[PDB]
Amino acid sequence: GAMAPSYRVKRMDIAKNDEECVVNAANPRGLPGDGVCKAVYKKWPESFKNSATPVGTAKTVMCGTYPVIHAVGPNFSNYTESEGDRELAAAYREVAKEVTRLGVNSVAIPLLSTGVYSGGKDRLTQSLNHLFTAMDSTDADVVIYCRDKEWEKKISEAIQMRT
Numbered sequence: 001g002a003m004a005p006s007y008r009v010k011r012m013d014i015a016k017n018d019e020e021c022v023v024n025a026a027n028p029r030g031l032p033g034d035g036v037c038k039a040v041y042k043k044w045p046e047s048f049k050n051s052a053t054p055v056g057t058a059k060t061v062m063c064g065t066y067p068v069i070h071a072v073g074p075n076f077s078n079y080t081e082s083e084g085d086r087e088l089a090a091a092y093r094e095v096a097k098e099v100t101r102l103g104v105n106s107v108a109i110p111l112l113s114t115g116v117y118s119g120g121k122d123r124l125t126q127s128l129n130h131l132f133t134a135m136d137s138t139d140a141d142v143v144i145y146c147r148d149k150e151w152e153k154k155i156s157e158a159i160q161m162r163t
């Protein structure tokens with residue numbers, strides 16, 4: 001574990017992370033995708049061998065010895081608010097299981113279902129609170145990656161609020 005497990009937030013490409021493993025905002029079919037998923041495909045393409053997994057699950061594939069945890073959040077275009085909320089919570093619970101299983105001291109994680117799977121809504125708070133619910137019982141250092149300047153400030157505030 002980390003000596004003093006922490007949450008941090010950085011505004012940059014998750015493909016440049018300084019953590020011991022990465023969470024991909026994957027599609028269910030293991031396709032290259034767009035946004036975070038495309039960046040992960042360019043950096044760790046070997047990790048897309050047999051990475052297809054259902055919505056609400058996570059599947060880890062090694063790139064060398066570097067673990068890529070493919071986490072499939074729901075696309076809110078297809079799910080009801082109720083069913084999507086349940087699947088988004090479930091995906092993060094499966095990320096916490098994998099992070100624990102791998103024995104890593106640190107993990108880089110994006111906010112699932114906040115980009116092209118958001119169904120055109122702002123889901124920062126919804127997605128971050130499900131991240132915290134899953135990861136709070138883990139002892140890895142968690143580093144959340146985002147690209148928007150206003151989101152960085154809001155994620156940083158939410159972390160500092162609970163310290």
Ligand SMILES: COC(=O)c1ccc(O)cc1
Nearest residue numbers: 013014035036039145146
């Ligand atoms: C946290 O978001 C990213 O890491 C990211 C990377 C590449 C993109 O094109 C978009 C977002």
Ligand SMILES: [Cl-]
Nearest residue numbers: 011012013016
């Ligand atoms: Cl960058």
Ligand SMILES: [Cl-]
Nearest residue numbers: 114115116117
């Ligand atoms: Cl997304």
Ligand SMILES: [Cl-]
Nearest residue numbers: 146147148151
């Ligand atoms: Cl963002």
